[PDB]
Nucleic acid binder design. Structure first.
Length: 56
DNA sequence: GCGATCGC
DNA sequence: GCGATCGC
């Protein structure tokens, strides 16, 4: 899986590979894609939106 | 609240 | 079982 440019909860921009990705959309609607990331410095897990074209 | 996911 | 993730 490709790295994603995200802002971490610590407030830093990092290109990180997500541990898990999935589509989050109500039925019949466009939604978003979410990834689960781990902050490389604090170990804290966080979710973040993925680009709309990111492979699920 | 909906939608899924999972760390806590 | 809740918070947190987006955009309605």
């Amino acid at each position: 899986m490709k790295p994603v440019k995200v802002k971490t909860p610590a407030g830093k921009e990092a290109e990180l590979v997500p541990e898990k990705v999935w589509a989050l959309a109500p039925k019949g609607r466009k939604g978003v894609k979410i990834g689960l990331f781990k902050d490389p410095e604090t170990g804290k897990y966080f979710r973040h939106k993925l680009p709309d074209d990111y492979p699920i």
